[PDB]
Design a protein around this ligand. Structure first.
Ligand code: FLZ
Length: 347
């Protein structure tokens, strides 16, 4: 049956959650809502509980709510954030206005771990391995994260990793000397073309390098500065990639730059495992068609001690035909309601 709910003012709003969730404590800002830590008495797990803010105030918002719910309900992988629970105090569609999402509480993110410092090679192997394991899974469902960065990567005490916030930033927050842009592939940063899944492999490259050196790979002070930093390392594009830049505007700007050759990565990453160097070179390729994929990278010699072809699963098919669908608010809200009602908890 329907559990009993109790009310409690947290942050600015009134939170109405089932009794099973106790000791609710405001933690931080999440994707499109505020998060609380709580103790789930049914499972014994410490959980993060997100209440979405105005989930149905516009078509843009309503579809976004449906999208996040659809995405979280699909993901069943060790290295990817999963949904423990989803609930509404509403007893019917007509009184349905709020959505709460529940996942595992994570200890820290990857920012806190790096902490200006170099990590050991074996720690880097393990963390990148897990990211690539989760990405293989995500990509096999034709889902792109689009915004991988250390703050989207949560790790527990055992250095066990989960990927957060996939498949979902305003112009202002991508401006200047900001971590929100430092991990973005150049084709997406400057909208060169219709982009694919390998945008995420570029991000892994930036993260891996940061874990190896303890320093941001491309700490651009703005879009242009960052592009220059990128092209100094990987070289200016050739005719081949230029043809693929469908924006006539961007292609024209690229051509104005003095041609630069690719740098030697062994001289950039001094003291690093030659196998780590090799992988970085295959990840940080300017032409996205030629980047290593997650499945391919898992088989790279650098991960020899973790790689297991029989323990690197793919996803069930993910139907995202709704993405090209135009619906009314109430229609997106009804679809969202069906998804809440039909939720079945994990083992
Ligand atoms: C920042 N964040 C989320 O945005 C988040 O989003 C949700 C997704 C689905 C349902 C509910 C919430 C969950 C989450 C869990 N755990 C930590 N742990 C943090 C502790 C403090 O260090 C950083 C990691 N963060 C989290």
């Amino acid at each position: 049956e329907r559990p009993t709910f109790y009310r409690q003012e947290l942050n600015k709003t009134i939170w109405e959650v089932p009794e099973r969730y106790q000791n609710l404590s405001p933690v931080g800002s999440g994707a499109y809502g505020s998060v609380c830590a709580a103790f789930d008495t049914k499972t014994g797990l410490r959980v993060a509980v997100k209440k979405l803010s105005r989930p149905f105030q516009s078509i843009i918002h309503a579809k976004r709510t449906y999208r996040e719910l659809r995405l979280l309900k699909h993901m069943k992988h060790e290295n990817v954030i999963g949904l423990l629970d989803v609930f509404t105090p509403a007893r019917s569609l007509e009184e349905f206005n709020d959505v709460y999402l529940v996942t595992h509480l994570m200890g820290a993110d990857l920012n806190n771990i790096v902490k200006c410092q170099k990590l050991t090679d074996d720690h880097v192997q393990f963390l990148i391995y897990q990211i690539l394991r989760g990405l293989k899974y995500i990509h096999s469902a034709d889902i792109i994260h689009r915004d991988l960065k250390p703050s989207n990567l949560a790790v527990n005490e055992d250095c066990e990793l989960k990927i957060l916030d996939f498949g979902l930033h305003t112009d202002d927050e991508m401006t200047g000397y900001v971590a929100t842009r430092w991990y973005r592939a150049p084709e997406i940063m400057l909208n060169w073309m219709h982009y694919n899944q390998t945008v995420d492999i570029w991000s892994v490259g930036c993260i891996m390098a940061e874990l190896l050196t303890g320093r941001t790979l491309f700490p651009g002070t703005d879009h242009i500065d960052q592009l220059k930093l990128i092209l100094r390392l990987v070289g200016t594009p050739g005719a081949e990639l230029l043809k693929k830049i469908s924006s006539e505007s961007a292609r024209n700007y690229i051509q104005s730059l003095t041609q630069m050759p690719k740098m030697n990565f062994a001289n950039v990453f001094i003291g690093a495992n030659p196998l780590a160097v090799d992988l970085l070179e295959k990840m940080l390729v300017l032409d996205s068609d030629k980047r290593i994929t997650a499945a391919q990278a898992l088989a790279h010699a650098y991960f020899a001690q973790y790689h297991d072809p029989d323990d690197e699963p793919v996803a069930d098919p993910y139907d995202q035909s709704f993405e090209s669908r135009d619906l009314l608010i109430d229609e997106w809200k009804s679809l969202t309601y069906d998804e809440v009602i039909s939720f079945v908890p994990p083992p």
